[PDB]
Design an enzyme around this catalytic site. Structure first.
Site, PDB file in Angstrom:
ATOM      1  N   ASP A 166      -4.167  -6.631   9.099  1.00 28.72           N
ATOM      2  CA  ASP A 166      -3.370  -5.469   8.871  1.00 28.72           C
ATOM      3  C   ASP A 166      -2.688  -5.468   7.552  1.00 28.72           C
ATOM      4  OD1 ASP A 166      -1.723  -3.429   9.315  1.00 28.72           O
ATOM      5  OD2 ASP A 166      -0.624  -4.376  11.077  1.00 28.72           O
ATOM      6  N   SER A 221      -1.579   8.524  -4.865  1.00 23.74           N
ATOM      7  CA  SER A 221      -2.843   9.369  -5.025  1.00 23.74           C
ATOM      8  C   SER A 221      -2.540  10.390  -6.230  1.00 23.74           C
ATOM      9  CB  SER A 221      -3.185   9.847  -3.617  1.00 23.74           C
ATOM     10  OG  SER A 221      -4.459  10.675  -3.854  1.00 23.74           O
TER      11      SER A 221
END
Length: 330
Positions: free
Chosen positions: A35, A199
């Site tokens: 994770d 992004s």
């Protein structure tokens, strides 16, 4: 040193991936959910409330000759999905794919919430976010990666998750045969303890690319892709019959519909998520309504590049003094 382990989806939908981890002496092998969105290595154990264990493999520290109680230490974690667990702590030897850390904090669960009990395939979590998020008290503990880092050939790990198939976590090296083209690296902020990056934009299907900054986290422990409501609405508007269902808790669509791809930007580079990766199947057995793999992050408080996005790429988690993230197509 290096390590290399295969990671395997828990079910036919890629709801999560499990990676075998050796704990203790002699080794006890547990299948952990790696994770990159959390920083605790915790396991079902001989100390877990009996009624909360249902099929998981447990760690028994009393059977490990290298286990040592971390005296006074406790831990307690709550995840974004509302699940939680807590307990006490041992140090022990932990190996992943041939890479061994001695003195790793292994957080033994005394209590786990229902979603963990109900998932027989996940024996615990291995956190790979920054150690500043680790919940052990009074002495915060380091992640497996942080402990291994100085011994690794290069201070990196990589995630190469498969679509409806196994993939690979590597530690200490970049497998240049595992991706196509070049790796584009992008800046990371560690201020919230995550692999947080920005992004450069998105496209839906064959549509034109929209240049827009989307801050989010690279999170292998989250199944879906969670993005701003504007982006998500633009995606589902291109799917015949798609709608947001408050009763279901997100966007659904008829399985007779064709899903467009979704492209996200990494600097000037582009990662294309094929439409098929966005199908999470019937909302209930026999239903003609399918659950979407791109959902709104509104009210999460952060955008999450989960498995839907990451499995479309070869992803480098670069733990150099100034951390960065790399993405390649594959």
């Amino acid at each position: 040193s290096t390590g290399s382990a295969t990671t395997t989806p828990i079910d036919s939908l890629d709801d999560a991936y499990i990676t075998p981890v050796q704990i203790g002496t002699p080794a006890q092998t547990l299948n952990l959910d790696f994770d990159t969105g959390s920083s605790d290595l915790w396991v079902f154990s001989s100390e877990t409330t009996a009624s909360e264990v249902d099929g998981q493999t447990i760690y028994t520290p009393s059977k490990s000759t290298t286990a040592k109680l971390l005296s006074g230490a406790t831990w307690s974690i709550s995840y974004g999905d509302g699940s939680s667990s807590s307990g006490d702590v041992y140090t022990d030897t932990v190996s992943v794919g041939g890479l061994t850390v001695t003195g790793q904090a292994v957080e033994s669960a005394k209590k786990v919430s229902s979603s963990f009990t109900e998932d027989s395939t996940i024996d615990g979590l291995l956190g790979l976010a920054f150690s500043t998020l680790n919940t052990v008290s009074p002495t915060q503990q380091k992640t497996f990666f942080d402990n291994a880092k100085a011994s690794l050939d290069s201070p990196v790990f990589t995630a190469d998750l498969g679509y409806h198939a196994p993939g690979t976590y590597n530690f200490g090296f970049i497998d240049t045969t595992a991706y196509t083209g070049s790796i584009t690296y992008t800046a990371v902020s560690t201020k919230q303890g995550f692999w947080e990056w920005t992004s450069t934009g998105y496209a839906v299907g064959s549509g034109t690319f929209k240049s827009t900054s989307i801050d989010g986290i690279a999170d292998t422990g989250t199944t879906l892709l969670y993005l701003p409501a504007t982006v998500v609405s633009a995606y589902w508007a291109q799917v015949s019959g798609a709608k947001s269902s408050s009763s279901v808790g997100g966007y659904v669509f008829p399985c007779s519909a064709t899903l467009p791809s979704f492209t996200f930007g990494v600097g000037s580079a582009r990662i294309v998520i094929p439409g098929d990766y966005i199908d999470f199947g019937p909302i209930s057995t026999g239903s003609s309504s399918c659950f979407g793999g791109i959902q709104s992050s509104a009210g999460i408080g952060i955008n999450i590049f989960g498995d839907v996005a990451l499995k479309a790429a070869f992803v480098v988690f670069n733990g150099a003094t100034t951390p960065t993230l790399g993405f390649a197509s594959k």
